[PDB]
Amino acid sequence: MPVLLGIPLLLRFLGFLLVTLFGYLLTFLKKGFGKIAIAISLFLALIIGLNSILVGYLSDISAQLPSDFVQGVQLILPSNALPCFYVILSVKAAIFIFDVKQKIVSYLDWDK
């Protein structure tokens, strides 16, 4: 299909610019997915950090019940007493895992 002497080179060039420019958009996309990697890392590192401080206070402020105040406690205590206490400590843990995991699903809105 006959054409002029310069048209075939205008048509090859208009698809070199497009591939180059669509090449830059890719490079920048990948960079922004690296920010959400740095961010997540930081957060989880600050949590693991606080843990190590707090668990390091409780070692020198320690005391035990005198041995004379046992005969008392072991006359009044039911069977479901200590089992109940443990529940109040397991419900706490569960809620902390729910909270951390709910904040990792919100990082899916950082790539928009």
Place this chain on the structure above:
Amino acid sequence: MPVLLGIPLLLRFLGFLLVTLFGYLLTFLKKGFGKIAIAISLFLALIIGLNSILVG
């Protein structure tokens, strides 16, 4: 590779506009990273400010 008398200047011009326009996007990017500098500054300055009142 023989071409007409005006095609080589259409091809040089279509890459002058692109570099000029891609030049403006850079200028505006840098401005928006300056807003997040002003913002952070402000916040930390309001905290340091309250401290000085309360301890007084």
